């Protein structure tokens, strides 16, 4: 199989990039960063973020792997002392792959991103929430956050959103300081949506701050923002059982 | 073919009681093996009807008229005789299995809640055989997807579309203070995940399953999981959950 | 004049007489009838039912609280030795609970006060200075003193208030908040002379709780909270940094 | 209310732009601007209302307010609130009450609300609502990351007269601070200081806070 490695960029990660590279040169594994069927990030979820987004249009046949140098996070499954084991288990092609859902933002011709964590909207902020073409509330406040299961441990969590197991195929909207009065009556609860439900947020300025994962692009004169579970998923090469609730224990308790 | 009807028993469900029985007079009644169980009175009625025919859940398609589970207005009660009259495809909602050890098994359609008597409520939460937290507070609520709009909402949970096969635990008035630190956040578990509540000091709790809230001495494990069974709804129109979320909580402009 | 109260355990009984061994000198005498200093041994729960012994001699008694391993007690066991010597005044507010039927009972409270059902739905109406404010269907209501905000009030989502501040704090418990029973959701801090009143609508329910004592009442006509004219007095030797003891109890 | 402007100051003493009365237009929003005398309002929580007014034109009644202090030191008064947030990346700040550390807050930011300012933003961040007369101030948290590292108090915090919360940086040195509606960034802030000002605001009165709250939210 072909492969490529990204680095956090500190000397110890680059140092393990090159060692892993020379580790792989002995097996039937070639190095490719334009068409890799295996992608490695060194340095944690924030860097894992960039790898994911560096190969969005070949997400379909890439098998991601992550190494994190300190604590574990939620995307890295691996310690750098354990690279040596990884290099030979990967060569042997001894890995099962796992699908996590993604969240498609649509802007309105139109723009259209992917999101492994979340996606937010700000910029006096007043937007009409429309679920499956049927109005649901009129929201005044800071913003809204649509987040993926994998994203529920992140800004989701800090907004009162629930922690979801990544395998569940869903999205979840949470408010950001909703005023919630007579005029602008909002649910308060977070809203956990399934595949094929579309939430469309529609204006009442039209120039919002729209951040996909971390990239915030300010958009101009927006006629609609539309969120939904994406048909594309993301695949992790896995060698051992993952324990989501453990890592939630570990990060927070 | 066959059918029956639960009634709240109030003086509104009771005109419609036989007014639908006599209505069906030209298209017969079972109270023991019906193919249909029709609820008249509200959501708590529907539940008692669920807990009365939970045994036969495999061949039943439930339906309900209100005077989140009733999709029918009393003025349409005869266009419902006409719609059942011919014969719809069912849509199904997951349920929450509940095991008690000392082994007593129960399904719920909304929630299951654990509290203690007097004496503080402290219980070890254990997920997939592994310790996750030691929680102190008023109690803990595990809700089904349909149940999220119920108690779970007032607790601080998310609302979930009932197609999603999951369950949801939420915290009741937890103490967080360097002795006891809880997640706080609500937690959505998929199928095949097992959340088990194991006792600490006091070992006699109050365990509710939907509306039937019973007391238990002797307890040494309480074990939530999502069931392999489901409840089926009979529908001729059909349903927009968020539409109903919007009606109960935001506005009902008509 | 002095007194002490004890927890019941060996350790608490241990030092009660030791301090009365140090007090038998000096110009001070014991009478658990007319004391003006009352000393808790054993923590904050034990402090609570001591107070509840001397309510009618409140505005006249000092309280110091002795402690094992807290928000009311400001001394540990080792430190009893010098305490005897220089015992040889600060206020925190209270909250009167009034119930009506068919005659009225009343209860001062140092932490909070909670309403519940006796079985079914708790469905109540919140009338504030005789002007309806919301209708509540949930589990119950909590109204806390400031000195009680670190208690059950903290868990329900209430604000932490410094105790000098003269207020009360209504918080909800699992309100349905739908379009029928719409609630503010937020905590609400009522000041002196504001009367908050809990009328029922259907069933005449109510398992009430004051601090820790949960007494049933059947057919209650009406319930009323308001900031206390009486006040509880603490004998103090140092300066108090409530915010530091909030750090300790809750942040690691 | 350009139309209601000189409308009935034609109906009426005098007028000059050191007033003894400043009347507010069309609601709470730009009463905040008029903010920076007995004040009164008519709205198209602060404007308790026009002919019968100058007809009646009074008791003056007290609402408290908030001092901000950034460090020459500049200071900013507040009718509603004051907030600190980071310019780009991780907002990380240390909370020092009464000259003694309390917690290290990481996330979006923090919000010091006045008693009258509790029905505003503070409400939406989870603050309590206080009848303004209560001599106090309140801090509420914005979107904390509460884990192993940055353990925070969670609850909103209410402080009285003379108590001082001081917010101090840990990594980067600028934050977008702002008070009431203005939005004035600051680089090179080493301390941010919230304390009830000795100040007071007087209202010209001829309320039922709990009913205005009722009418706005219920």
From Swiss-Prot, chain C:
GO terms for molecular function: ATP binding; metal ion binding; NAD binding; NAD+ kinase activity. The keyword Transcription does not apply. Its cofactor is a divalent metal cation. It comes from the Bacteria. It is an enzyme of class 2 (transferase). Keywords: ATP-binding, Cytoplasm, Kinase, NAD, NADP, Nucleotide-binding, Transferase. Changing residue 212 to E: Twice less active than the wild-type. Its activity toward DTA is increased 2-fold. HAMAP family: NAD_kinase. Belongs to the NAD kinase family. This is NAD kinase 1. The gene is nadK1.
